[model samples]
Target: PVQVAVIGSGGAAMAAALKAVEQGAQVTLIERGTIGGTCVNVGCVPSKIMIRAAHIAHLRRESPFDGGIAATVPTIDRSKLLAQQQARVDELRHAKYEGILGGNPAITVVHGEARFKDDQSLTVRLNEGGERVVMFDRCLVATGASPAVPPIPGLKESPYWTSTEALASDTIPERLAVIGSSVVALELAQAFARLGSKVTVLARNTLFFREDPAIGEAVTAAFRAEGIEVLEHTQASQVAHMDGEFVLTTTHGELRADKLLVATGRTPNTRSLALDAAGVTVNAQGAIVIDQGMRTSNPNIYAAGDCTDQPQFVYVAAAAGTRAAINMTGGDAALDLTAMPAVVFTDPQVATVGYSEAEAHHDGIETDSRTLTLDNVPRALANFDTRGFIKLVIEEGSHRLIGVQAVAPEAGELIQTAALAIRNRMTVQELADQLFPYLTMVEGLKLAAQTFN
Candidate 1:
């Protein structure tokens, strides 16, 4: 019987173990696959590297906006660039998996999948066999979510890949059609298009619906700039293998692609865990029910990260992972899901936190919103990027910063302050008077937030 057993070895699991150890608890982590899991192995780290390559490609072709500066930009070597991205993944796997995990004394990371053997214990199937029973005082189910392949007719019949296979490959596809407008679809589609693949985004609604219209609009503008077509409000009726391409029958007729990606959604990786033995309650969609502090249906057992569906983001999962560990150690820890920052790291990246304009509208806060174009920002013009804007929505009665949505060259770095302000309840005037750094992307954010006033 162990003091504590953690399920899954993703970022959330790593964080949970470290945090639990810090709170004076002995910990052991059970993982079925690689230590860093999907995000490090196939998701966040690889996606960023791919997008960075795409951004460089965009700069090469975009001569008009190159600050009137004459410079030679070469067509990116697709294989070489892909190799570099894969190398980055390999480096992280070594550093985090070996270095971080090895350095921790209070943590034991087992290469196994944990299933409930009975009440208050788990049957840990080892990577090297030899079944072991772990009776834990507390358990954290951070196994994360699994990808759901869409019900496209021919999609299942062909050799295709998700974010996992696509990122692992060295050679790029000639034409690819992404089947969702979620963050994964946008980032990958744009990356492929920038890498010279004929890429199209077959999104039903997009981040615009989940976020604000302005956020979606800004992303749409970025997509259009990249020359990637958006098949929005369209449904894929039938998909069939025809000739050399994957034929997509949608509301807008037929589209063809050499490769197809289904990034619609994910399910909690809990089916094999056998939580039913522990009498753990789960949602209809297989999400483990948990309180704010990551407490499961049973007080002794807990869950966090993508397993709970609080927020489908890495940072949120990391934060919740920590909160779960702290709570497990009998420490005072509270979970706050607000002001969780997220971004679609495409060209002129879309970074956002807190409530957006659409959310305010949904809640009946009909205040005037102001948009500041990046064209006016000196740095944007100098950097040859003037194709985006920062939108600020202020409540008329309060004149407070309700939400901010933007697409800029460095929107990821810039939106952090907006997130901080929203978390601290900073108003428009409060955000306006700040001395924003010179030649930086965030200056646009400070300027945009005060436009209505």
Candidate 2:
């Protein structure tokens, strides 16, 4: 059996190990703490389950205007709800990690902290008992990352939560001060607000800078409707805990919260691996360096997931890991993440699968954008989620669709078809050329993109 060692437990490591073992390569998997890593434990899986709870809360709150019975949401049992969500994460993905390893006799599971001593070997500090020095024919550095709490003075001493701590909460605070506009912050903000926290969100940057600003603005509007305050063009400068209150100092002044969450960002987990000892070069920010095929600086080693900067999405990690494993097993697999889908989970969720309007302009492509309003859409009226839109940007002369942006409840569902259109280089005329089924929400996309003038 040929030996292949994989590190990290995110979708990257789990997917890679499965692929490599399927290829008949002997796999040794090492994870520090959890089985499903960040995505399953904290990032995607747990987060989305929380989002469902948020959406239910939204529906209950809008009962007066949203065509429902006029009843209060009742005292939400946050602990019970969180437990339900965690149960789902564990039952769905978390529990499956060990079973996958057990399924393959060629695969050995090691729970430990791995620090590379050389390109071919890693010294693992065993979580079980003693140390086992593992020398492998090949290794994958998928250690992922941790939340990056900026140098906000007194924050460490301040009683606050990171996404990690927040996700494992037994109770929701009466008030929450969310610091950071990153995806994690946004998710935490909505979930907490829905769970009955008086949420005050402070964003370091305008939310979702990578996506269209309109999406963020629409979400901000929704937050306003929900009585959640959105603080933009500002940040929390300091944090302190006193008298049963966590105080945050911002540009405006001091604000107190029952709970304060620092949702700033995440730092790569590559430093501990001691990449230098193994001849593996990490980037300036300590993210592992990988080639087009996720090959590390050391030819015998590879990196994937949040440990590298190639769009820190679960699917991206899975795709990259799959490719790396295939290529490692002497297969001609190439990692091509030309169209990575990034989804922002909020009420009327934001999803983008293709280029943005700015990206088209940056590439010097003369593009014209057309947007359709959700308020004007029939299905949106029926669904009571008329807080969104769908837009398409096409090349001026070629009429090829370059970008699609939308802010609908089912925004995530709308992107898949639009992405396919962009991928096939389908022009506006070509899109109009098809007999697309017409619905108020979906038909607006057809109308918006079909118009040339």
Candidate 3:
């Protein structure tokens, strides 16, 4: 039997293990901490539950129908909410991760910290205080990533919450200051504000600064409208915690908050693995550099998920892992992310698939684009919440549907269709002509496509 050694039990690790075993390999899966990884434990699962709860709270407090249906500020019991959120997380971790691993007789589970000894061997320090040597014909690294905290003077010495801590926190602080402008920061900022915090976001630039400029503008407008203070082009020079309050000396001025959250980014968990011993190459950020087939520089070693330079979405990690397993077992497979879909679960959710106008232009592709405001969509008109827009980009000559970016309520549910359209290389006319059920948020895609004509 082929021997496979896998590190980390996250989405990528589990997927690769299962696939490799199915391909007639014996697998040893190593995990130093929890069985299930970031998503089910500290990431997507918990964060989404909290975000959903906050959304409910926001809707109850204010909506277009509030005039017809009496609006009420729902009392938030974060302890009870946390209990509910964790229950689901635990159930999923067991049902999807631990339970599956336990039932797989072809796989062995090891609780230890694994470091590469060479291309074919690993030295593991067992959690219960013992050392074990694992030798394998093939190995996979899917150690994932952790929250990255920037170096602000005195920031590390002070108590600050990362996304993990913020999600696990039972009490929402009265005044919360967040030092980030990206997905994690904006999502939690809005969630806490909805949950009754006076949330202040300190962005080094504008919100979603890395994305299309309009995205940042629209989201910032929505956030400010909800009484969340967004300080754009702001950075903290220093941080100090005194008497249960956080004082941030910023580029603009001094700001005070009851709690501080730093959600700048995530760092890959590749440093301690000692990849140099295996001759595996990682980028400057310490992320393992893998080919589309998920093979590292060392042919015998593979990598996937956040630890790799690939996108950090769990679904992407799973797909890459499956493909990596196939290649590891002497099968040819590759991951294509040209039409990958991404979503940010903020109010008026942001969803994008394929290139933005700037990206297409940068790639030297002649493009034409159109934007359809939600006010033009019948569903948004009926719902009385027309706060966002759907934008479509197409090849200038062939008029092929190449991209879709949207900001709308429930936008996540609408991006897959665009992905499929882009993947199929459909033209704007083709999508616009397709039959779409009226009065649905997704129908906005067709309206945006029609504008291309």
Candidate 4:
């Protein structure tokens, strides 16, 4: 049996180890921290539960049906909510990660920090104060990423919360100031606001600036209506924390808040791996460059997840890990992400798959697209909360569905259908002709497709 050594017991590491063992390989998995990676512990699972709770709170306080049903402000209890969130997190981490690894005789779990000694060996500094050398026929680096903090005057010196700290915090501040405009920034900002905080978002550019401009505009309007301040083209020049309050000096003015959060982005966790010893190449951002089969520059080594130059989604990481395992064990496999789906879990969820107009135009492809406002959908109208739009982008000549972007309530539930259509190379006319159950949010896809005619 081939020996496979895996580093960092995250989503990618667990997936790769399990699949490699199934391929009749002996595996040794190493972890320096928690067993489960970011998703179950901090990134996805806890964040989503908090967001859902905030959503329920928002609906109870204000909704389209409030005219008929009396709207009541839900009491925010941070301690109870945090307990519930952490309980679920613990349950999943054990069930999915620890239990599986413990029962698998083909896989050995090691607690240590691993550094590459060469293409065929690793030097692991054990957590319990010892060192061990591991030799492998093949290796996988599945170390994930960490929160990235930008260089701002005095920002680092002040007490500020990253996503991890923000999620684990059991108290909601009376006034919160956020210094980012991306997915994590917007999601947590709204969550805290609905949970009874006066939240202010400072965006260096407009919200979702890299995406369709219309997306930013729609979300900005929705946020403002809900009393969350959206400050566009703004960033803090200086930060000072004193007297249990945060003072942010920006181009606009001095903004004060009870707490500050920095959710700019994430940096791949690769600096300490001593990759040069193994002759592995990394991109400028320090992410390992890998092929579609998850092979790195070093033939005997592989990488996946946020440590590699792929979309930083847990599902994407798992898919890449499985494929890497297949390739490492003399099998053929490749990951196709042409129709990859992504979602931002805000109140009006932002779900997108495939190319946007700007992206296709840059690729020199002629495209035709249409946007269907939520007001046009029967379900949105019936629910009396038509606050967003769904758009379909197709090839100008072939009329094939190449992309779909939606900003609506529960939009995450509808993007997989769009991904399937894009993956199968279905034409707009074909999608339009398909039977869709009436008054469903997903039926809006057909309605948007019909507009192309």
Candidate 5:
């Protein structure tokens, strides 16, 4: 029987270990922290739950139906809301994580800090007691990632919150200042604003620079509509804790908030693993370097998840984990991100797949792109919330649907069809001719495709 050692207990680690067990390999999974990674613990799962609650609170106060239907404003209890979020996290962590491990008797769970002792061996500083040495024919490093806190002067000494700390807050601050303008920054900023926090977002650069410009504008408009101030092309030069408040000295001016959130980005948890000992390589950004098959510099080692340089999504991590396991067990598997989909869970969610028009142009792919505002969509008119637009990028000659971008209320749900279309190399004509339900948000794709003609 082949002995396999897996590091971390997150989605990727679990996926890799589970696959190894199915191959009848002896597997040891190690995690010093919680079983579930950022997604279940502090990210997608918890944040979306709160975002939904906040949306409910927002709708109650400002409903589309004016006829006494939404007269009573909804009140939010932060403690109760967080408690419920925690409850859901705990339940899922057990059912999806611990339960999975229990079901796999071939897999052993270890609570410890894992560091590479050599290419084929590692040392685990056990959480219960002393260190243990493990030798394996193959090892998977899925140690995951953490929030990348920038070295803004005085920030370390001050009481600032990272993405993790902000999610489980027992009390919503009176004023919240968030740094960075990516998905994490926007989602949390809007959630807090709707939850009754006077929110201010400081963007270091253009919001979602990789996306079409229309998305940034539409989302900014939505934020302003919610009474949230978004300051663009702004960055904090210094941070300090004043009397009962955090003050940020920025390129624009000095601003103060009751609580400060640093939503800049994330970094892989690879440095502590002592990758040099295992002969594995990492990029300057600290992400593990891997090939399409998820193989590392060391022949006996494989890597996946945020720890590796793949798209940082739980689904991506899970898929990569499975791929790595197959390759580790002397099988052939590869990951293709040509049609990977990503969504930002805000009121008017931002969803993208394949390529943006700008990205396509940069890559020398000649494309014809069209942007259709939601105000013209029947569903948006019926819902009374036309906050975004859908943009489609098609190959100029073949008219192949190569990209999809949407900022509609159902943008997250709206992009899957486009993803399938892109992956299948469906042309604009094919998408335009497809029958779609009337008065549906997804129908916008067809309408977008028709614009090309």
Candidate 6:
């Protein structure tokens, strides 16, 4: 039996360990901090719960319900909200992490910080006490990533919150200034603003510049409609805490807020791993460089999730983790994401899968695409909230779907269908011809596909 050691207890780490154990490997899963890693601990699970709560509060206040239904706005108690969110987190941590590992006798869960002593040896400084040295036939680095803070002057010294802290915040700030326009920035900005904070977003460039301008414009429009202030083309030079608030000095002028959030980007958790000791190479961004097989420079070692340069989604991490485990355990496997979907869980969620038109053009593939607004969708009109659109990209001559992007309330759920179409190389004609119920958000896909003709 192979001795497999997996580091970090995030989605990727846990998935890899489970896969290895199923393959009859003796797996030692090491976690430095919390058991469930960032997803259940800080990133996805907690944030989405808060976003849902904020959304409910916003809907009650806005009262867009039909038949003149009046909804009463609910007061937000931060302590209670945080307590509720934490309770769910605790339950999930136990059920998902503790239950999964504890029930498996083949897998040993180690709470410790791990560093590479050599290509095949790891020194794990146990969180509870001393260190333990472990030798493995195969190893995986799934240490995940952390919020990347910019080098703005005094910004670090001030009480600026990262996604972790912001999600775990006990009290909502009166005025919150968010820096950068990453996915986390937009999601949390809208979440808090809807929850009654005077939120301002300061971005160096327009939001999600890499995506289609229409997507960003639609989301920004929604933000503005909600009374959220977005300052584009803005850069902060310095920050200071004065008069019990944060004052940020920007190229534009002075901006003050009761709190600050830094959501610039994420850095891989590879700094302390001593990758050099294991001959695992990392790129300039501090992300472990790996091939499609999820194999690091050292063939015996593999990496997945945010730690590597893969798309930073929990699902992706989980998928890559499983693939890495299979490949490391004498099996032939590789990571394939030709139709992988990415989502930003904001109001009117933003979702994209496969290639955009620009991306296809950049890759020298001729493409055809169409954009359709939700105004024409029956469900959006019935709900009295037509806030976004969907765009589909297809191979010019083949008419086969290459990509799909949507900014709609149910975009996340809708993208899976598009992902399936793209993965199976379904043509626009086929998609249009498919049976789709009327008055549904997903029906827009068929309509968008029909527009190609």
TM-score for predicted model 1 compared with the true structure: 0.93
Shift in Å, residue 211, candidate 1: 1.6
Q: Return the lDDT, model 4, position 111.
A: 90
- For 1-453, candidate 1 gives per-residue lDDT tens digits of 237789987877888888888877888888888878878888999988888887777667765645676545456677888788878898998898657888888888788778998768899888898888887898888999988888777678877678887777676678887888887878888888887788877878655567767667877877886688888887787877767778888888888888877788788988988988998899999999988788888888888888886778877788888888888888768788567677778877887766667677788877777888889787888866688888877777888776777787788888888888888887888888888887788888777765665
Report model 2's TM-score to 2 decimal places. 0.95
Model 4 compared with the native: what TM-score? 0.99
Q: How many backbone clashes can be found in candidate 1? A: 0
Error of 2 at 351 (Å): 1.2
CA lDDT scores, all candidates in order: 0.80, 0.81, 0.93, 0.93, 0.90, 0.91
Q: Estimate the lDDT of model 3.
A: 0.93
List model 3 lDDT by residue over 192-296, tens digit each.
999999999999988898888878888998899889999998999999999999999997799999999999999999877989999999999989988879999
Quote the positional error of residue 315 for candidate 2 in Å: 0.9
Give the per-residue lDDT of model 2 (tens digit) for 1-453. 668999987889988899999899988888889787888778788888888887887777664364446856757888899879888887866357666667778778888998987778899999877888898898888888898878888987776889978888988899999888888898889889988899999877678766788888888897888889898877877788988989888976778899988878888997678888989887788788889888988888988888998788888898889988987888767776555556688877777766678888888888788877787677777766678777788888888887788777777776777778887889877786777665645565676666665
Q: lDDT tens digits, residues 1-453, model 4?
A: 999999988788888999999999999998988999899999899999999999889999998887789999888999999999999999999999999999899999889899998888999999999999999999999999999898999998998999999999999999999999989999999999999999999999999999998789889988998999999999899999999999999978999999899999888998879999998999999999898888889989999998997888999999989889999999989999998999999978999999899999999999999999999999999999889999999999999999999999878988999999999999999999999999999999999999987
- Candidate 2 pairs with clashing backbones: 388-407
Residue 276 displacement in candidate 4 (angstroms): 0.7
Query: Model 6, 108-180: lDDT tens per residue?
Result: 9888899999998999999889999989999999999999889999988897899999998999899999998
Candidate 6 global lDDT: 0.91
In candidate 5, stretches whose alpha carbon ends up further than 4 angstroms from where it belongs are 67-73
- Report the candidate with higher lDDT, 3 versus 5: 3
List the candidates' TM-scores in order.
Answer: 0.93, 0.95, 0.99, 0.99, 0.98, 0.98
The per-residue C-alpha lDDT of model 4 at residue 224 equals 96
What is the C-alpha RMSD, rounded to one decimal, of candidate 6?
Answer: 1.2
